[model samples]
Target: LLTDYGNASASPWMKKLQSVAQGSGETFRILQIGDSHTAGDFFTDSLRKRLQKTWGDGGIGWVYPANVKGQRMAAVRHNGNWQSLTSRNNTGDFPLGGILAHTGSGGSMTLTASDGIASKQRVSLFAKPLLAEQTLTVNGNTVSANGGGWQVLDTGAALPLTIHTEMPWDIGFINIENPAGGITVSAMGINGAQLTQWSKWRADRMNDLAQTGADLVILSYGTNEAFNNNIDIADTEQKWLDTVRQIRDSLPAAGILIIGAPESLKNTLGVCGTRPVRLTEVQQMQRRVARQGQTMFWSWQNAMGGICSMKNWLNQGWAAKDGVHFSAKGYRRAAEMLADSLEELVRSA
Candidate 1:
């Protein structure tokens, strides 16, 4: 029933991914930016597994401090006493992606490898440029930290890392990579986040993403924005366009993918119903932006079935009772479809 699919062959970013997938390249990286749907990792994790299986394992990529905001990420566990900052609840100066963790002297955090792939990792710590000089221990090894920016630590296949700082520091995020080259897919999402929130941390976000040098960046938003009853399509579209422009300015060579909102339902008389206008508008706006070149579009709504499809999904137990989110099985199925499409595109290319 779904027919719309974006062609990535023309995109240089996609070409980079293709190179990595074909084993001609050593590494290919992806950054998935979205809201609660992505935050759950149910969708992105499924996609990660499929890609890694097809290509090669490039490690788990970036991992934000789990203690921050109590966010959930697959195959990661952390025990730490630290302060959490998120763009959704704060307007203060923060790191790129608007999520971070900070700790005072004597504070400590430990990260353990919960997944097999993570057992051996090459780790890097990201912090503010002006962060104070300090020393932390990684698996009993002393590592010095200073200034702002990225600090690549020789984790050397270390797992269950325990870090203790002697001085206060603000950490943006951490990257755990595989020593061997392959495909790296990193995902960052915030619960209840909207495009507007990203505007607040544009400069920081750009600098940070530029450092990662991702081959592709996927924007999977619109669900939270769709819940806004008074949203203006034109204004929303412009905001998304502006965000894309910023991203392009920072990573001009990276491929961009805009994933449209999936079918969702509204509550009506204790029954779940379709929000036809909102869904259609958001999807159209996203497609318009993608058409401007240097970008690709994927219609999750169409992929899932089409207007008013949430009802069917609910009946099939693929969607939650709230009619907004999908079940784990549903997410997995959607990821499979996306993976298949991507593979087809690569093969054709």
Candidate 2:
């Protein structure tokens, strides 16, 4: 079994909160869900590491069972065949489910040809503390495993039991295996995720997250969506509202934190300009979106001190390449900012 049961004292985040409260000691779990920015430890690795360092507890973070290409983080990595279909690129003839709409490159090692046309190659993880027999029910089929677990061929009404290889790789499952006691932070990021796209997530996604026992949810996005042409401010706002509402409905008890996108830097001539004049509209749009949803909004643009200020971050060698993402130092500062804000939110609540 995992160590550090359900006590907040065992949570790293609580430890930080305890310090913030001058030792009152309160703990909470945060499910940070977003796109690539949240995935691959882009800005999250240093954020999580530093948060745990100051706060006291830390976990491996989260991971998707079948990862999209170019998505890898410090805590988790998976090699899988992936496939996805959207307005940009749609593939396969089957009507896609919320989770199935985005497919991976590799199929799992289940569904043997011996089953004839019925067999469909799928993937899943082996069970822990292997029992003599394991009973798993999928799509009304209760298949018994005498020796090993099979890949997830399908998830019935309930969310699928996604498994990545090894312990940390399964961080997305929300089980913190920290032996020394730490906080549990769940980071769930879907790369290339559009605000409207989330409206389609399998109904079971939020349910499964709630089952992980996290206490908060961080919603981070907007970079990819900002690139869209012929933007509909009204529709974008509504989509975000619906998405958060859906999640809240699923986990009413969890604290919801909304993260706004950082200002986009534009390269003009030889030097990069920190001013994303257009980012002003984008940032305001995000803030308005957050306010309407009645969720806590962390303005990445404002928090960065102003528009295109990010360019200085990169020029001074504080940020990282691509100008969009931050470096370790950059992320650490951002995390501290968030932690400070979170501490206040928790206290006021």
Candidate 3:
């Protein structure tokens, strides 16, 4: 039988990495893949924002590549002589924007330089520009550019660009350039992620990340898995372990950390609920899974202090009516807690 490990700072899994035993500049990545809970940016937005505030330079965590309906912090702008193209109109079944193809060749979002501004800007995506030998024109002047070159997009500066998808998957890497000089944290997350999806995604997403030279990976998931009533514990555990194994295989040298789900915002009720529905038991199960997997675990429940405390925070408007989601303030608090935890972990390690 696999050895059962208890929570302790001295445990091998809990021990800090010798490689990161120094000052900042280490690129730590937190890949929070989950369902709407994860996708909603509910509390994650605040968490990411705070982390960046402490460690990263000022920049958005991740941006929706194209256009999406209700992305919390999504923006799209265009200026002078620029055009955007896609494969579909309004009827395509494809998920609306962000590198996903609404067309066959996927499609392209190109920005032809105009005026003297050079049509230069930085995009918020996972993978940096990797190709070159590209050229564009602006204001009767011709200019050459490379894919790996940096494009500056002032807050509102807009340009024409195309997003196309041809391969089975495309993993992009985007970093929020930390100007203040400190550690840089990358928030990598995807909503509606399942173990199977992760298994498939590793081939596309994580594989490329391995080459990017990131330092750490923070994994936040399991809420959606808990919601599935038919999911068996052993099966779920094995699938999750397999997913971790895949990610590890992809980023063999990177440190992997796990974030556990908190108590349910509400048990049986929908978003608009009057009382709290604690899922302490469920949270414990998730912790057990994390421990047994030999992973570093972040207990969301502990961060909140207790079940009633969480309810109070949610009632105070930290979480959405769904009880499962977080409000802006709640998100901030969550992020603060995560930052504190991460700082302590890093310092202690």
Best by TM-score: 1
Better TM-score candidate (2, 3): 2
Write down the worst ten-residue block by lDDT for model 1.
1-10
The C-alpha stretches of model 2 lying farther than 4 A from their native spots are 1-27, 66-68, 76-174, 177-182, 268-278, 344-349
As for candidate 1, its clashing pairs are 128-148, 129-148
Q: Using TM-score as the measure, name the better of candidate 1 and candidate 3.
A: 1
- For candidate 3, the TM-score is 0.63
Q: Candidate 2, which ten residues in sequence have the lowest lDDT sum?
A: 109-118
In candidate 3, residue 110 scores what lDDT? 37
- Candidate 2 lDDT by residue in tens digits, 1-349: 0111123234444445554344233444556767667755546665665566655543453334344445554554444433323222333221112222222222231111111122221222222112435443333455444553222222222122322221111111213323334455655565666656654543345555555445667778777767564567677787777777876687766556678787666453246574444455555777776666666678776777765577677777667767766776787677667776655544543
TM-score of each: 0.90, 0.64, 0.63
Q: Per-residue lDDT of 206-322 in model 3, one digit per residue for the tens? A: 444554344455667666665665666766666777766766687665555677776554442444332332244445655676676666677776676654455665668876656
Number of backbone clashes in candidate 1: 2
Off by over 4 Å in 1: 1-7, 22-25, 68-70, 117-120, 129-131, 146-157, 268-272
